[PDB]
């Protein structure tokens, strides 16, 4: 319980929702054979639905009055009540991958900017160089922090074009 | 215009080089009967002044107000007629 939320394990609405979904799937399954293709597909869907509901209830997710899982997006609140995998951990994972792609693109652009013909390098990508920079982008946090503390990650305001006010 | 050949410009006859033609106008003073013409010009004697002709239009404005205050009721307009019962509304209102 965080904000009046009940765990999905003890939520009656959650169980009723699972029961209703499985019931609808079985109702659709009743109009087929026992080993036909549609019957097997419906059985697989039923198994997946049951596994999903069981996993959600076992993972400790919080359910509201409507019986659906709710996510806690607040450090500390999610860390002390065991909900860090809702938004905190996904935030870290995203930030890492997003920074990886961004750093790889930045390095490729800066590397090809020194070539005699950079526009062609932009429309016709250098596959080996792009591959090497994509691999190097995995250490983007360390490289970015080093460049920031080094002062080479920024451009002087006096060297950037600006409008005549 | 002096269009005797292929010349459609003439400074001495610039009036004809700009297409200033009546096309269909025709001057003729022999048409309307004198007795009927006199009757109409006599009927519309002083009504040729802007202030006087506007007065005739002002009569139309009075007729508009007369219709609302009398004409509308004489034609049994639904808005000037009566009303029958009413309803209560969605909930306990009026």
């Amino acid at each position: 319980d965080v904000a009046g939320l009940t765990p999905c394990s003890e939520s009656k609405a959650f169980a009723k929702r699972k029961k209703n979904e499985v019931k609808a799937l079985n109702k659709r399954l009743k109009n087929y054979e026992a080993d036909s293709a549609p019957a097997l597909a419906l059985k697989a869907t039923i198994a997946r639905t049951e596994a999903r509901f069981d996993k959600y209830a076992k993972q400790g997710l919080l359910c509201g009055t409507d019986g659906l899982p709710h996510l806690i997006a607040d450090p500390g609140l999610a860390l002390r009540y065991g909900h860090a995998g809702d938004v905190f951990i996904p935030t870290i994972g995203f930030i890492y991958f997003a920074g990886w792609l961004g750093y790889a693109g930045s390095k490729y652009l800066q590397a090809v900017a020194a070539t005699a013909k950079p526009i062609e390098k932009e429309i016709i990508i250098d596959v080996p160089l792009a591959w090497k920079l994509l691999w190097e982008g995995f250490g983007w946090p360390l490289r970015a922090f080093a460049e920031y503390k080094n002062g080479s990650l920024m451009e002087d305001d006096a060297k950037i074009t600006v409008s005549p006010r | 215009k002096y269009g005797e050949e292929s010349r459609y410009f003439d400074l001495k006859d610039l009036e004809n080089t700009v297409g200033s033609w009546d096309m269909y106008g025709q001057e003729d003073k022999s048409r309307y009967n004198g007795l009927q013409s006199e009757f109409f010009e006599r009927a519309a004697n002083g009504l040729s002044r802007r202030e006087y002709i506007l007065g005739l239009v002002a009569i139309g404005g009075a007729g508009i107000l007369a219709w609302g205050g009398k004409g509308a009721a004489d034609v049994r307009l639904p808005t000037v007629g009566p009303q029958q019962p009413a309803q209560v509304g969605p909930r306990g209102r009026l």
């Binding site: 659709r28 109009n31 054979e33 293709a37 549609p38 597909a41 697989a44 997946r48 | -």
Partner: protein, 74 residues
Amino acid sequence: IWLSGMYFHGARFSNYEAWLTDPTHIKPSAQVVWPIVGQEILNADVGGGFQGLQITSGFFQLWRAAGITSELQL
């Protein structure tokens, strides 16, 4: 290429053979979706022990008028 794809789908992912036996109750279908993110719900119960997307191109009627009858011909 587009026509070949239409005939191939009508021969491998359709219920044309079953639709021929009951063209008034079985709804024509010539597309089957893979089960990846719950999208398998799009495989409707068209009829004839087949599940797929209901098509409205009229290919089943055209093939019937041409006397296709079998899936090997498609």
